[PDB]
Design a binder for this molecule. Structure first.
Ligand code: CLA
Ligand code: CLA
Ligand code: CLA
Ligand code: CLA
Ligand SMILES: C=Cc1c(C)c2cc3nc(c4c5[nH]c(cc6nc(cc1[nH]2)C(C)=C6CC)c(C)c5C(=O)[C@@H]4C(=O)OC)[C@@H](CCC(=O)OC/C=C(\C)CCC[C@H](C)CCC[C@H](C)CCCC(C)C)[C@@H]3C
Ligand SMILES: CC(C)=CCC/C(C)=C/CC/C(C)=C/CC/C(C)=C/CC/C(C)=C/CC/C(C)=C/CC/C(C)=C/CC/C(C)=C/CC/C(C)=C/CC1=CC(=O)C(C)=C(C)C1=O
Ligand SMILES: CCCCCCCCCCCCCCCCCC(=O)OC[C@H](CO[C@@H]1O[C@H](CO)[C@H](O)[C@H](O)[C@H]1O)OC(=O)CCCCCCCCCCCCCCCCC
Ligand SMILES: CCCCCCCCCCCCCCCCCC(=O)OC[C@H](CO[C@@H]1O[C@H](CO)[C@H](O)[C@H](O)[C@H]1O)OC(=O)CCCCCCCCCCCCCCCCC
Ligand SMILES: CCCCCCCCCCCCCCCC(=O)OC[C@H](CO[C@@H]1O[C@H](CS(=O)(=O)O)[C@@H](O)[C@H](O)[C@H]1O)OC(=O)CCCCCCCCCCCCCCC
Ligand code: HEC
Ligand SMILES: CC1=C(/C=C/C(C)=C/C=C/C(C)=C/C=C/C=C(C)/C=C/C=C(C)/C=C/C2=C(C)CCCC2(C)C)C(C)(C)CCC1
Ligand code: OEY
Ligand SMILES: [Cl-]
Ligand SMILES: [Cl-]
Lengths: 30, 32, 51, 97, 334, 36, 137, 244, 33
């Protein structure tokens, strides 16, 4: 169960990267 | 491995509780 | 008699012997089968075979 | 039922004297005249039944037999211990300074 | 135009969400291969005979590690510096046993990261920027080359490169101190000044700019909303930050040119980490830290120990225990 | 393995050549100001 | 503590005759042991054969005995194994073998005795450290 | 031919025993009034077989093939010894010295690694009686010693050993020691092996012979911490006989 | 009692995941009006 827990947390972070890059709030010049 | 089996629930809530907090604040922000 | 065939003739591998909340593999219940002990024959004091 | 064969040996005469059947060849440095020449012969001809069989080594010289006699009181024999004589450990046992 | 020109124009497009560029053409495949191998090996790789003595070290999560103890283990000492691609092994099983994933990961990674640096130059050219960000990055890159390539070259084996793990990193640092007295090396002391000073100047600059934000918001909103992205003007009063900091110390120990100040922030950590990367790279050739062991002696000749002798007793404890089955002869010459 | 070695040799070779040729394709002019 | 003539008094021979050395001689014998010997014998050990050190107790039990100046000087002229049975100038620096160990070429007989006295004096100063190895660093 | 190191280095041929032409099927005459010797004996394993653990129900274990993971480091060579002529006529080889052991790790299905000390230390191998010539039907059978795979100074990962090392599990200061004794107390095993060497090529002129061998021995027990496996090793051998 | 260890984590998630989902939708509902 411990291996699964470490890998799950690591996989959520990788998904976090994807959304944070491609689904960021676009910086706009206001 | 002979780990602490309370570690799983500690880790799970360590993650879920504060993450939920954030999600809740974010979503109600986007809806006003 | 091959052990494999003797192990089929055992109610612990009958799928209709479980429980809804008895979780996990069949091995968690009766254990991990190791060996056929042999076929048991019963007799009374008069030597009649019994079943 | 389980013991460390080496610790047990420390309780025998190996722990007090040079065991001609077991001890590492560097221990012969302790006494005058034994190292390297005679130590090489003792070890090469090793397993002895009694310390005094050492005087029968083929080809000793008369000065050598006397040096051995002067030092029989420093020698012992115990049964060969595999863990001490394998690996060429009687010549080099991994201990330096 | 023609096909090769459409392609060239795509590769170097400043409109891709992530810049590709010609360096990217090498960076992407090499980093992908390094990353996929590292993730799989970290989780699943079986034990690796790092020191060549048929004493395999388990580095992966499935073989009893956690995040902190796990590693991709360096390749076998039996291999030394020989190239050990997958195709040189008789089987994946042999390649895993002898630590092949490590070679594959670090070669693809040094390549990929060398090209990451070039990519930083490349994009700054397409954008009309000045070019020397990539110079700053040369300090971290140089450091990775040192622990993964240069130190193994000097010592003659990838088995002494840095493991790819949290605890493996510590192992490498303790053995290093034992064999090179790195604490007593001025290049490492310059590295510590680099990173300490970088942290300091980092907190200072942030504290000092934050201290002099112009009131542009109310007490109920984040101060940050007082800055609008791309605004013509500045949102802090540098003259006021100088007025504070110049008085904190004295007027000329303080910067009033924004460009001189930011150049200093760039140069301090970069230079220091250059030195500590060069420190690993030269200790790779056994030019070691200062040796003051038994340097003070009294009128008779007794050794009068100093703190350097106390360090040496710790070093000796590391020396005699590390790789406890790997030495047959009294000197550990590499 | 033999099959692996060849496939990697070709992959690497292809990517290397893209790199070389792309920088030869007038890289100095691919900038936002002066096309020399 | 200081470097006294009693410290600097060592066996000249097995006879129990002794000689006393000057500060200057002892230090000469340190410079010279460093120049010619410490590469292998730093601190009283022998890197190329740790089994043999330069502790006076070891020198004593050597054949011929060597816990005295003459026998040490002899050893540096004509070295032998620990039991005296073989000469070893082919592999150990010596005046006999100054052709192949060039560092020994320009050693005067007074240089040898300085080296011998340094060797004999140093364990009186350092004790266990000398010939003890890394345990005592 | 006469190859040089630089010809062989890095090719894997240094781990190969020499071979004899297909046309070497002569016989080496044995002169009972003469003394003989093996000047070089070379053994080169080609397959490593490990007996599988027949579960409690058992029926019969098999010898399962295995994968070698330690590369071209497996051969025994430069082995020497005297070839005695016994009076029943047989020949007996008595190993004196040589490179007569290689540590080898093979892998079983499932991923179990099996180290062993592939060896013929103290080989004593005899022919059948009344052997007046060595021929392409001459067999030797012998037995050898198999010492512990690690020797006495070897330290386990918690610092425990036989001739050195901690004698307890120092990370569990107040554990009951009794459940840990088999791992705390290191034991040095010495067992025996058996080998057959079947001569199949003979150059009567040079005294070179060549053939196949099979040997059986135990694998590593990790100084008593677990039970060893039975290993069967097969390969080829080469030997030169010189009169002494 | 010799009770199924995972019962605890199962119960906590069983409560927490569905509950958190409802709260998320409630709070963002209130922030609209
Ligand atoms: C068709 C789906 C299916 C089936 C038939 C199986 C079958 C099996 N799995 Mg698998 N599994 C599945 C899906 C499935 N799995 C999925 C989707 C997952 C991901 C979570 C897993 C993860 C998984 C693991 C991690 C393990 C198994 C294991 C097993 C075995 C033991 C099952 C057990 O103890 O049941 C337990 C079943 C129950 C306790 C019944 C639960 C149903 C609840 C009561 C319903 C909830 C009611 C609901 C709240 C009602 C409200 C409605 C109303 C309000 C409107 C068995 C062979 C185990 C095994 O032995 O493998 C080695 C094991 O360790 N499975
Ligand atoms: C940008 C692409 C790129 C680059 C630069 C590298 C670079 C490298 N790889 Mg990686 N690799 C990549 C993509 C890349 N890889 C991809 C996409 C995969 C997945 C398929 C892999 C899979 C992979 C594996 C599985 C392994 C490597 C290995 C290596 C190393 C040596 C490769 C080698 O021997 O070729 C050397 C280069 C050449 C032979 C060509 C040089 C270029 C000239 C100009 C051409 C020469 C003509 C050529 C010989 C013709 C081919 C056919 C010929 C034999 C007849 C090096 C670090 C090996 C490794 O890390 O071992 C430690 C290894 O085991 N790579
Ligand atoms: C008690 C506080 C204290 C002080 C004053 C120092 C000071 C120092 N340490 Mg030490 N250190 C400390 C605690 C301290 N350390 C602690 C708790 C640890 C962890 C246990 C360490 C671990 C550590 C390591 C491992 C190393 C140092 C090093 C250094 C030097 C460089 C530090 C540096 O660049 O800082 C960053 C700060 C700046 C760049 C700002 C300037 C700071 C300087 C030193 C002050 C200038 C004095 C000034 C000229 C005199 C007055 C001027 C006036 C006339 C105008 C310096 C001598 C390195 C070293 O030994 O180099 C020899 C090194 O290798 N330190
Ligand atoms: C307070 C005590 C102290 C302090 C402050 C330091 C400080 C430092 N030590 Mg010293 N050290 C100490 C005690 C200390 N040490 C002690 C006690 C020992 C003896 C046990 C040592 C032994 C020691 C060794 C042996 C080494 C150091 C090194 C270093 C440096 C490490 C940082 C570095 O290399 O950055 C440089 C930057 C990098 C290494 C990063 C490169 C990043 C690559 C290019 C990119 C990676 C990308 C990543 C994989 C993916 C991210 C993607 C993500 C966004 C998803 C730094 C100067 C190291 C050094 O000088 O290395 C050059 C070194 O090797 N130390
Ligand atoms: C240990 C310290 C340390 C780390 C880990 C680190 C990390 C990083 N610094 C970067 C940049 C920088 N760092 C800078 C100065 C500094 N950086 C420092 C110290 C560090 N910097 C210090 C001390 C300084 C002051 C000099 C600058 C000036 C830059 C940059 O410009 C650069 C950047 O872009 O900043 C945002 C990034 C490089 C991105 C890249 O190459 O992607 C490419 C590689 C990728 C995406 C994935 C690689 C995956 C590989 C294959 C994983 C397996 C192999 C690893 C080596 C495994 C390691 C395992 C560990 C447990 C040891 C990255 C976030
Ligand atoms: C008993 C009695 C007498 C009591 C009465 C007391 C009394 C009245 C006494 C009389 C007065 C008196 C002084 C007595 C003499 C005593 C005396 C001499 C005191 C000893 C004090 C002591 C030695 C301290 C040493 C000084 C010390 C702190 C070191 C300073 C050295 C120094 C220059 C280092 C820092 C270097 C520096 C340039 C830092 C830059 C940091 C950095 C890059 C920040 C980023 C940044 C910077 C900016 O600059 C601005 C702008 C912005 C934006 C910004 O991001
Ligand atoms: C609320 C939502 C929950 C949030 C996440 C909760 C998890 C958070 C982490 C929990 C603690 C992690 C402990 C590891 C898990 C473990 O087994 O614990 C489990 C242990 C209980 O210990 C159990 O005891 C049992 C017998 O009673 C058995 O011995 C079990 O083996 C043993 O696990 O938890 C604690 O003991 C209770 C925690 C109280 C700790 C107070 C001391 C800390 C005070 C310092 C805090 C400083 C903070 C500094 C940060 C800045
Ligand atoms: C999103 C995440 C939130 C979802 C999880 C929320 C928690 C809900 C958990 C409910 C499951 C309760 C499991 C309790 C048992 C447990 O703890 O043991 C954990 C058990 C596994 O069992 C474990 O196995 C181990 C070795 O494998 C040992 O045997 C352990 O003793 C045993 O506990 O988990 C399951 O078996 C997992 C899969 C079960 C899925 C099959 C269901 C098929 C039935 C379909 C009917 C659907 C009905 C719908 C009705 C409407
Ligand atoms: C006899 C013994 C032997 C002697 C040997 C001599 C050795 C001395 C070498 C001298 C080197 C010259 C100085 C460096 C170049 C320089 O002037 O920069 C140019 C700028 C211009 O300054 C700016 O100058 C500007 C005027 S101008 O640009 O010069 O024209 C002005 O606008 C601005 O206000 C002002 O700040 O300097 C600054 O920005 C001020 C900060 C200076 C930072 C020092 C240099 C980099 C530090 C690296 C060290 C890191 C340490 C590692 C930590 C672990
Ligand atoms: C390395 C090549 C050496 C140098 C340089 C010097 N010595 Fe040495 N010494 C060396 C060895 C390998 C040995 C062992 C010889 C053997 O018996 O096989 C020795 C031994 C001595 C001794 C005898 C010590 C004893 O306990 O019996 C002495 C007195 C000695 N060496 C002195 C000596 C001096 C004075 C040197 C400088 C000129 C010197 N050695 C250089 C190895 C090496
Ligand atoms: C074309 C192109 C491109 C793209 C490219 C790409 C995208 C690439 C990719 C690549 C990749 C994607 C690759 C990968 C790699 C991988 C690898 C190479 C891996 C390996 C692995 C391994 C080998 C492992 C193994 C193992 C282990 C470790 C453990 C367990 C077991 C096993 C066996 C599984 C671009 C845009 C640039 C542009 C130009 C063109
Ligand atoms: O420091 Mn010590 O030295 Ca460089 O090798 Mn010799 O021992 Mn070993 O393998 Mn990694 O480590
Ligand atoms: Cl180590
Ligand atoms: Cl070694």
């Amino acid at each position: 169960m411990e291996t699964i827990t470490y890998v799950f947390i690591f996989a959520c972070i990788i998904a976090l990267f994807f959304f944070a890059i491609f689904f960021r709030e676009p910086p706009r010049i206001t | 491995m002979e780990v602490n089996q309370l570690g799983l629930i500690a880790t799970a809530l360590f993650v879920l509780v504060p993450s939920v907090f954030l999600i809740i604040l974010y979503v109600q922000t986007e809806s006003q | 008699i091959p052990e494999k065939l003797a192990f089929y003739d055992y109610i612990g591998n009958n799928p209709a012997k479980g429980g809804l909340f008895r979780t996990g593999p069949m091995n968690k219940g009766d254990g991990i089968a190791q060996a056929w002990k042999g076929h048991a024959v019963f007799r009374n004091k008069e030597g009649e075979e019994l079943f | 039922e389980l013991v460390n064969v080496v610790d047990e040996k420390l309780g025998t005469a190996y722990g007090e004297k040079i065991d001609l059947n077991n001890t590492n060849i560097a221990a012969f440095i302790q006494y005058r005249g034994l190292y390297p020449t005679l130590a090489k012969l003792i070890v090469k001809n090793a397993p002895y039944e009694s310390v005094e069989d050492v005087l029968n080594i083929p080809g000793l010289t008369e000065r050598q037999k006397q040096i051995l006699r002067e030092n029989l009181e420093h020698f012992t024999v115990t049964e060969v211990e595999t863990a001490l004589v394998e690996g060429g450990d009687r010549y080099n046992n991994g201990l330096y300074k | 135009a023609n096909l090769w020109e459409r392609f060239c124009n795509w590769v170097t497009s400043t409109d891709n969400r992530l810049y590709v560029g010609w360096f990217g053409v090498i960076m992407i495949p090499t980093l992908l291969a390094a990353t996929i191998c590292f993730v799989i090996a970290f989780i699943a790789a079986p034990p690796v005979d790092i020191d060549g003595i048929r004493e395999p070290v388990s580095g992966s999560l499935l073989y009893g590690n956690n995040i902190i103890t796990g590693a991709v283990v360096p390749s076998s000492n039996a291999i030394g510096l020989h190239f050990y691609p997958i195709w040189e092994a008789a089987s994946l099983d042999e390649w895993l046993y002898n630590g092949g994933p490590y070679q594959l990961i670090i070669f693809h990674f040094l390549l990929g990261a060398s090209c990451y640096m070039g990519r930083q130059w490349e994009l700054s050219y397409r954008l009309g920027m000045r070019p020397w960000i990539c110079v700053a990055y040369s300090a971290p890159l140089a450091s990775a080359f040192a622990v993964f390539l240069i130190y193994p070259i000097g010592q003659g084996s990838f088995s002494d490169g840095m493991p790819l793990g949290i605890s493996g990193t510590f192992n490498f640092m303790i053995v290093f101190q034992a064999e090179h007295n790195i604490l007593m090396h001025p290049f490492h002391q310059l590295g510590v000044a680099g990173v300490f000073g970088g942290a300091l100047f980092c907190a200072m600059h942030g504290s000092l700019v934050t201290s002099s934000l112009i009131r542009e918001t109310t007490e109920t909103e984040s101060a940050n909303y007082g800055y609008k992205f791309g605004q013509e003007e500045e949102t802090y009063n540098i003259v006021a930050a100088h007025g504070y900091f110049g008085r904190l110390i004295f007027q000329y120990a303080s910067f009033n040119n924004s460009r001189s100040l930011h150049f200093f922030l760039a140069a301090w950590p970069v230079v220091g980490v250059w030195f500590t990367a060069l420190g690993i790279s030269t200790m790779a050739f056994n030019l070691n830290g200062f040796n003051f062991n038994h340097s003070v002696i009294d009128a008779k000749g007794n050794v009068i120990n100093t703190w350097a002798d106390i360090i040496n007793r710790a070093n000796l404890g590391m020396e005699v225990m590390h790789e406890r089955n790997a030495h047959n002869f009294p000197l550990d010459l590499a | 393995m033999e099959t692996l070695k060849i496939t990697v040799y070709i992959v690497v070779t292809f990517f290397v050549l893209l790199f070389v040729f792309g920088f030869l394709s007038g890289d100095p002019a691919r900038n936002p100001k002066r096309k020399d | 503590a200081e470097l006294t003539p009693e410290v600097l008094t060592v066996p000249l021979n097995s006879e129990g005759k002794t000689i006393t050395l000057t500060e200057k001689q002892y230090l000469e014998g340190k410079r010279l042991f460093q120049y010619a010997c410490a590469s292998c014998h730093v601190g009283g050990i022998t890197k190329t054969n740790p089994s043999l050190d330069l502790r006076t107790e070891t020198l004593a039990l050597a054949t011929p005995p060597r816990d005295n100046i003459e026998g040490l000087v002899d050893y540096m002229k004509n070295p032998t194994t620990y039991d005296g049975e073989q000469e070893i100038a082919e592999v150990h620096p010596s005046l006999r073998s100054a052709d192949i160990f060039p560092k020994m070429r320009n050693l005067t007989e007074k240089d040898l005795v300085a080296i011998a006295g340094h060797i004999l004096v140093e364990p009186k100063i350092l004790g266990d450290k000398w010939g003890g190895g890394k345990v005592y660093y | 031919q006469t190859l040089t190191y630089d010809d062989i280095v890095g090719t894997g041929l240094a781990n190969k025993c020499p071979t004899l032409d297909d046309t070497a099927r002569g016989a080496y005459p044995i002169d009972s009034s003469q003394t003989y010797r093996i000047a070089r004996l070379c053994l080169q394993p080609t397959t490593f077989l490990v007996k599988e653990e027949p579960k409690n129900k058992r029926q019969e274990a098999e010898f399962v093939p295995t994968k070698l993971v330690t590369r071209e480091t497996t051969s025994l060579d430069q082995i020497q010894g005297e070839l005695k002529v016994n009076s029943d006529g047989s020949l007996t080889f008595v190993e004196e010295d040589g490179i007569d052991f290689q540590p080898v790790t093979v892998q079983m299905a499932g991923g179990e690694r099996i180290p062993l000390l592939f060896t013929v230390k103290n080989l004593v191998a005899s022919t059948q009686p009344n052997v007046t010539s060595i021929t392409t039907s001459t067999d030797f059978k012998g037995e050898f010693n198999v010492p512990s795979y690690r020797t006495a100074n070897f330290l386990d990962p918690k610092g425990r050993g036989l001739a050195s090392g901690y004698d307890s599990a120092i990370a569990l200061p107040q554990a009951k020691e009794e459940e840990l004794a088999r791992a705390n107390v290191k034991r040095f095993s010495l067992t025996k092996g058996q080998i057959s060497l079947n001569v199949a090529k003979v150059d009567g002129r040079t005294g070179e012979i060549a053939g196949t061998f099979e040997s059986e021995q135990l694998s590593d027990d990790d100084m008593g911490a677990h039970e060893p496996h039975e290993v069967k090793i097969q390969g080829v051998f080469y030997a030169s006989i010189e009169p002494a």
